[PDB]
Design a protein around this nucleic acid. Sequence first.
RNA 1: CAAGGAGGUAAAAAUGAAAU
RNA 2: CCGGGCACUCUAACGGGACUGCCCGCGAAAGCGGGAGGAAGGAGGGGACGACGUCUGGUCAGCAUGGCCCUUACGGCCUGGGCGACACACGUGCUACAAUGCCCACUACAAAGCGAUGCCACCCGGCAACGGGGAGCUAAUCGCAAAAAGGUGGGCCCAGUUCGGAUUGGGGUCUGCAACCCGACCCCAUGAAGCCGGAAUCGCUAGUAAUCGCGGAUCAGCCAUGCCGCGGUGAAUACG
Lengths: 99, 206, 60, 25, 82, 128, 91, 118, 155
Amino acid sequence: KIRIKLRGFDHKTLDASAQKIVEAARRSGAQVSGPIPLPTRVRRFTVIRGPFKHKDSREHFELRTHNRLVDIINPNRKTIEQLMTLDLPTGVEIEIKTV
Amino acid sequence: GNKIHPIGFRLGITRDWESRWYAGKKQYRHLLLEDQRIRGLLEKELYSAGLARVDIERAADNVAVTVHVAKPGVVIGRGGERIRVLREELAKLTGKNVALNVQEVQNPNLSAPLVAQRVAEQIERRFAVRRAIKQAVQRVMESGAKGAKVIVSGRIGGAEQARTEWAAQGRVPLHTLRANIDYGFALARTTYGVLGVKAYIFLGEV
Amino acid sequence: ARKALIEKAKRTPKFKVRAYTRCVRCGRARSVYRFFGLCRICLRELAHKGQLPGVRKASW
Amino acid sequence: GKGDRRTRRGKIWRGTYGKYRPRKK
Amino acid sequence: SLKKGVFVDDHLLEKVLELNAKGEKRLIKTWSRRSTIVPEMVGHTIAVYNGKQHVPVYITENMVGHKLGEFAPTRTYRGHGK
Amino acid sequence: MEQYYGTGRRKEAVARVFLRPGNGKVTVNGQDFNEYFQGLVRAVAALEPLRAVDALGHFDAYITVRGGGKSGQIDAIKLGIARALVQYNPDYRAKLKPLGFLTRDARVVERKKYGKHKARRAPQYSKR
Amino acid sequence: GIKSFKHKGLKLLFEKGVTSGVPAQDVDRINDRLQAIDTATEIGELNRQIYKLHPLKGDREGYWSITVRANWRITFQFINGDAYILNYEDY
Amino acid sequence: ARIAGVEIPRNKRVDVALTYIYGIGKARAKEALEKTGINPATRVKDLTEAEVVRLREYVENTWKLEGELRAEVAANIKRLMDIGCYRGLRHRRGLPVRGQRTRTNARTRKGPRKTVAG
Amino acid sequence: ARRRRAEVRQLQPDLVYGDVLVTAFINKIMRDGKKNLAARIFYDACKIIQEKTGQEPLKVFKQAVENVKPRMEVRSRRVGGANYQVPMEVSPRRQQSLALRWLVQAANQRPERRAAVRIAHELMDAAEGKGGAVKKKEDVERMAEANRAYAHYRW
RNA sequence: CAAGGAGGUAAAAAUGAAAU
RNA sequence: CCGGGCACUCUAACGGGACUGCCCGCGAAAGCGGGAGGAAGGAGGGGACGACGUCUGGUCAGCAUGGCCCUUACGGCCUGGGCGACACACGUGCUACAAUGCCCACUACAAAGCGAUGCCACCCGGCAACGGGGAGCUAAUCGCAAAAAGGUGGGCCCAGUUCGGAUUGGGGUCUGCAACCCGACCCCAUGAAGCCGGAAUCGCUAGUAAUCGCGGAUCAGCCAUGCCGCGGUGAAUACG
Ligand SMILES: [Mg+2]
Ligand SMILES: [Mg+2]
Ligand SMILES: [Mg+2]
Ligand SMILES: [Mg+2]
Ligand SMILES: [Mg+2]
Ligand SMILES: [Mg+2]
Ligand SMILES: [Mg+2]
Ligand SMILES: [Mg+2]
Ligand SMILES: [Mg+2]
Ligand SMILES: [Mg+2]
Ligand SMILES: [Mg+2]
Ligand SMILES: [Mg+2]
Ligand SMILES: [Mg+2]
Ligand SMILES: [Zn+2]
């Protein structure tokens, strides 16, 4: 019933921090749908390489925003207990909602 | 010439970020401006420390700020000032958790920003630049470096004629990705103008 | 006209259409990205610095 | 007639819709 | 092309209407084409600014959607060598 | 009713090919292998690996397709049909190689590169 | 008589006395030269040693060039007692 | 058939033949024959005289067309004669009315190139 | 400087025929990369061949190409600011290419209305030895004929 | 199978640029 | 669409995968040619990467900065004008000159990206632009979008003609304090030049040229036919 979403710019921190919550939910009495890899939202932009006025030949950058989903079954305060405030991100945004 | 910033050229693999936080739109713009104003405010009254980095991390009103310094001499024991209101003056336009840490950069002769900054000081001391370059390189090479390279360009020793002094010992492969190459830069302000100091420090990888 | 001109860019009163974007790091009025609030010049500088969270070189 | 404002083809090219090119169904 | 607005300058009209009761003098300036021809005070002259000076334009019916400054060219041209 | 693998891809096109051992040479997806591919000459070339083998309608085709346009889909179907008959007939390998019906064909649309007008077409100049 | 300008800064210095288009230390210099080119009734008058006068070659044929200072030139076309296309440029 | 001021178009579809009149174009064309109730794909070759009469009576009336509306259009430009606006001066000088680019192009009103050279 | 001799491109055989030639012809018909319209026109014209003559288009088309084959062509070469025109032999690859190219071009040169009838007729004319392409072929061989003088320059 | 000594030699295509 | 399942497809995270390693031939070696080996090969196809240096190259109008000059002003604010001017010349382009074409209707097949101070389903008024409503969507959920060339049917029948769309008149919409100078669309009527380009000149060697539409940045709006991307169909030729 409990749905958690984890967005992030770094994939290595995401693929690891959203895997901790798979271990911290499985070893507390619940069935956990593993790291669901939602598609990425790549936000590119292309900037002229020079401060002057050399239109041809520039250089572009991208801001990949990754999405990862995990669902746990029963909202028992046994699994809730651990995932309550035992948070270890580096800024990774987490969404917790039940529906 | 034309060569890409050896830091940006890595970023992903080798050399991580310097401001590590995540946000969507309507927030990124505000938090980046604040973030940059922290870097701007710190650089001023903390230059005497000579800061190699200014790492920043966030987590909803958490704002962690790690200041790497060769010699953290300007911290002086708890209530001995140089930290108290100093790490608290940040929250005069922030008001968030101003968690300011201090790191001890062990060898300053292996920190590119510090190397270039030491050189740029010497330019303003009216030192002989070519000899200053040579020494700084060997100094870096003396402290165990796998390769080094310092570059001062323009208006050397005053004198109407922009020059470019060049020195580099050992190995500095800029094209390679598994490089671990530290890059630093510094503005030397002189009574006759402005000149830039590049500093490249290289260690192994694989 | 540059100092009094980066004043108006933040002042923003009097008719809603007279307000415009403006790089914060610089004072550039052109090629100002809404996402960063920066000109294309400054944005490139900081992206190479590493001071742009997540922002990375694009190769494909 | 990619530039004639009285065709489904010119309306495509211009982008906009209208009588010569209705917004589907 | 407005339809439910169809506007004239309030300040142009203030000066134009309070100088319209039982008659007036043609001494009346402006600084904005922005307005519109305005019926009533047709037998009037409106010195419109063209960027350099105030050109006395005259109203004699015939004009409507043409605000003002169309009766006040801003350029000169006049000729190209010939 | 039945199943036989199916993974044919060509230039952003995905086709899952099944075939069910029955004399009814049939179709899939929208309408007929015709109908859905009518007016298209090269559409019927996807059934050439069946001609390469001894299949004059021994299977009931079932290919769900997606992505790309018709031609790529048709190409992908060819790769899927072949991928089926090579799967449940491992000895039918000695015809998918000489005839070359088994290749994903990495030939895909090349990226728009800056400066150039489109892929490789240079923007054209005059010195004067 | 000077009759046409190509350089805006030059134009403003001679017409309105606007000096903000030229170098500040070359104001007097450029002025005395322009007045000389204005008073000149023939190219032979623009021949003082301090001007280093000469006609240009190639595509710039028909033009002349007196020296202001350093690598800086005032170029023009002199014809029938008048100079045209007064430009300020590098050598 | 001498419909308005013209008669020319013979064997060539009435919805098309109609077009050959200053005032008809394409929209008023099918609009006129659906309102008159006549088959558009007909021969134009003098078919049923009745259909031709009804068509003529409706078309030639209703809206202004041919030489009459050419006169009105020319008179609408003559409006900006007197002491007219800016748009009139553009009709005076022979230059484009809608304020476009005249540095190049604008040949459809200026006419073929004249070349000054200097 | 052509270090590689540029290997000969190979095609896909068509539908119903299996030609290693017809598809090459359909390609020349093809404009803007529409093989659908291209192939259709040829097969259309194939249906048109059946009408005016009781012959199978696979031979009518085949023989037409064979009749629009340049035995030898003229080649401009060396010494004198490239002044000479040595008449050279034509490679089977080039006869191939010229035949199909001249066919389609001459076909669209015809005053007919539909693309199919142009193709069909130009093929029938060429199969006989009458086509405008056959003119082109015979013309190119005239040029090669008149240059036998310094043909011994060869190469 | 390896070369020295001998001979016919390109064409029609001119200028130079604006302080060291 | 539900029950249920997640093997297929896809999604995105780490991996496996060829190194001419294996066979023939050539060679002193490097290596080259050829062959089953497989999705792939003798740098697989594209990116990011630009040596010492050169051009007194470019940029004091991104920014920084030595020097020179201006300070009731070379600074500051405002309304209006101008950057959009047009007898002309060059560059890069878009749309065409038609029948492998144009118009109308029906009916399919993408990728890559953007949106809750917005994208706006479905209705309602309206020929239409668009307006009234109003659901879902912090968005592999909802929306932008039906991709277009294609296919089927039908109509023009080769004439500047249902090719072509310039130019101009009239009527309207939407953003905006306001669109005359100088906004984009919509509708009616006009319908120009052009019937394929002189001397010259450009691009591209395989998904490539050509052709077709789609997205984004900036952005109240938009002068975008531009730029940066995405995929659809898909040639010709290389002797030398
Ligand atoms: Mg360009
Ligand atoms: Mg802006
Ligand atoms: Mg493409
Ligand atoms: Mg204009
Ligand atoms: Mg000479
Ligand atoms: Mg010389
Ligand atoms: Mg490399
Ligand atoms: Mg220079
Ligand atoms: Mg400056
Ligand atoms: Mg401009
Ligand atoms: Mg004509
Ligand atoms: Mg014609
Ligand atoms: Mg190549
Ligand atoms: Zn800036």
